[PDB]
Design a binder for this molecule. Structure first.
Ligand SMILES: [Mn+2]
Ligand SMILES: [Mn+2]
Lengths: 123, 322, 322, 123
């Protein structure tokens, strides 16, 4: 869908204890966070667990584990969600490759909608 | 009867996604091409839905007055899989639908594009709520289905004993794909599909060989997973009978004039328009052909998407075929 | 007109296979039921085909005269994949077809049941040969297809620019499968399917949910490979529109009155016969309803197949519906 | 189709150097022996190669390896083919389990039609 735009460019920032970056879901409409069945995040060769993912949409930050409860919250189309990842090891200064795969629980689709992106940002 | 040229703002989803054109910009671009009919995905370009402010709706009406546009169809999306591990109770689906019923009524929309997967029971329960607001509910007939599919037949049998003119159909043009779309073919080729097998698949689609035979044979000749995906694409895209619309002309409220690529000659490569627009014309159709630019997904990774130019060429094609 | 009760000796294929019924016995049993129309699979009941002895055909005519039966339709079988790693040229297909044509002419058959997969090109090239013998070539429309499938539409367009009344259709009764066949259900349950998921699949079939949604959801509830196969059965068995037969009546030479199980009340549990036979009546049908018993392959696991009794019940159900 | 009748009862007899048994193809009509994409026969559960089979339809026997040119030979419906397997081991008296799997390259069917049987015969 928008698989070349998921990892926003020039968005890799260093949060104390982790790294945050902008993500746009590979879908053509606003989708609630509960329907994000899988959001696999890799930051330079290591997949980030869901307990290490906090999605910040607007001013509301939700641990990705508790996303099922966040049915009301909607990921707006084109909105850059700040997907903070509490990486166990700090990202050393320089160029880092961030790649996000998406599996969306679309109701009118028998199988989850799949998107994927892998960009090379820097901090 | 006149077929009105409309545009689904879905067509500009690319430019809206990258914050290159706003909703005002999208409606102005539609007004530039004379395609005053506007079909909107509230979940796509109206953040805050369904909890929008009255000021938003006043601004929407001000937009429409400024650009002479008319809001025609609202695309409702029913998230029956909202809650993991279960489906929405039909009672929950009633209130979720009521949201779009009220949103569309406030926007001034006349039709609601209901997805093809909604059960006829849900359309039966929300029917009184729709009559409260005088809202037409149009089930989307998109490929891999047609006006003779058993699911559509059960919808018809459910809405024949209800006898309500607010229940009807929104046919897609993907049920009139007479060629394997070239944009899809070249996308598959640049995803790692072997070109000769792709030509084979395209010829098989032209011969209407069944998706099962095509998948089996492409597998036998040696096909990568992308190639078997190209073969499975025949399941989705199908060529239905254009004349079948004449039977159901009364229950067709909106047509998604979808397209993938408009060449320099204002020609739609694959989808059958030279055969369908005459059918609508002799069917007495008086509605909107909403330009649904679909090729942006396929010309995405190696081509600059110019949604406005493609939609403009499509609008010219429609104007010529009308 | 009149709808003639006939039988496909395919119905008694179980008895012939185990050498309980000879061809003479099969035709005599058909005569007992009053189902004089005989439909034969030359590759199934008549060894020595294609090159049969000239005395075989005299014996066949003597059989028919003795039992008052009439040979109606010959089931042709085109082995396009006859040669490994190759598809027999259209030239080979032409002579393989002429084989069956001049077998049917000598047998005394009026129709040739062409398989549903033959290309319209092959039907076009063998048409001059079929005019010499005055043989009708009826393409079998059997599930998952119908009179509105793209393949059937291509066949139709190929045979309207030919204008030959020797090209038509042989509708199968699996395109009217009102319910998931109970015999199929119990087979699947005793192949190892989980009963509750099977009831779910049957309900989904009754609701006409698309086979893709059913396959996905059944996969989500813990369906076994046999259970997913039960789900994929939805692809093959489908409920078509019985009213579609009305506009293609002049091209329907033969009807395969397929059935799976006849209960003690002469009732077909699954297929649409109360809906279809009236369609054939009102449209105007003068062909044969060839009883084609098909449950033999599903009850064979544990039940003793009584082909004659099942076909007898089907014959009197047909007689009461006519 | 006829998957309980593939291996014929009371047919396992002993030929010099092997064992022959009657097989009926799990198909509702007569097939050319070339369209038999695979006939996997296991005597006592140990598969024998396709070069150790010699189908004996009627009065002519053809090595199963060269069946692709055995094109016009038809396996008649219900006909007991005397499938011969020259096992590289002399079978001893008693009960022997013979199983046969059939993958038939049917033309009007996208995938090979599959039948299977496993009977317990004796010699
Ligand atoms: Mn559409
Ligand atoms: Mn049939």
């Amino acid at each position: 869908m928008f698989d070349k735009y998921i990892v926003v460019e020039d968005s890799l920032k260093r949060v104390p204890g982790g790294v945050q970056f902008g993500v746009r879901l590979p879908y053509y409409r606003g989708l609630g966070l509960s329907m994000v069945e899988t959001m696999d995040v890799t930051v330079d060769g290591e997949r980030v667990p869901e307990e290490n993912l906090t999605v910040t949409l607007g001013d509301r930050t939700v641990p990705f584990a508790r996303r099922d409860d966040e049915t009301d919250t909607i990921w707006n189309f084109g909105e850059i969600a700040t997907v903070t990842a509490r990486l166990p090891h700090e990202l050393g200064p320089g160029e880092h490759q961030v790649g996000v795969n998406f599996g969306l629980r679309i109701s009118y689709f028998p199988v989850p909608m799949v998107g994927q992106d892998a960009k090379t940002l820097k901090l | 009867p006149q077929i009105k040229r409309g545009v689904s703002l879905y067509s500009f989803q690319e430019e809206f996604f990258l914050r290159k054109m706003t909703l005002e910009d999208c409606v102005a671009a539609c007004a530039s091409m004379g395609a005053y009919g506007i079909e909107s995905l509230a979940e796509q370009m109206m953040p805050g839905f369904p909890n929008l402010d009255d000021a938003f709706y006043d601004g929407w009406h001000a937009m429409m007055a400024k650009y002479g546009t008319v809001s025609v169809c609202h695309d409702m999306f029913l998230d029956t899989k909202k809650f993991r591990g279960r489906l929405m109770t039909l009672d929950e689906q009633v209130e979720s639908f009521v949201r779009d019923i009220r949103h569309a009524s406030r926007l001034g929309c006349t039709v609601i594009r209901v997805l093809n997967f909604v059960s006829p029971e849900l359309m039966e329960k929300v029917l009184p709520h729709a009559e409260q607001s005088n809202m037409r509910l149009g089930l989307e007939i998109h490929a891999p289905m047609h006006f003779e599919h058993p699911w559509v037949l059960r919808h018809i049998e459910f809405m024949d004993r209800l006898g309500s003119p607010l229940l009807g159909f929104i046919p897609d043009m993907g049920i009139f794909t007479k060629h394997f779309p070239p944009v899809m073919a070249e996308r598959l080729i640049r995803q790692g599909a072997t070109p000769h097998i792709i030509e084979y698949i395209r010829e098989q689609y032209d011969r209407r060989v069944l998706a099962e035979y095509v998948v089996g044979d492409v597998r036998n000749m040696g096909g990568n997973p992308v190639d078997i995906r190209a073969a499975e694409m025949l399941r989705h895209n199908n060529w239905s009978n254009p004349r079948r619309l004449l039977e159901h002309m009364d229950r067709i409220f909106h047509v998604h004039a979808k397209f993938y690529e408009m060449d320099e000659q204002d020609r739609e490569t694959s989808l059958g328009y030279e055969e369908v627009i005459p059918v609508l014309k002799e069917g007495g159709y008086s509605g909107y052909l909403a330009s649904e630019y679909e090729g942006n997904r396929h010309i995405q990774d190696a081509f600059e998407v110019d949604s406005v130019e493609q939609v403009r060429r499509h609008q010219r094609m429609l104007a010529r075929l009308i």
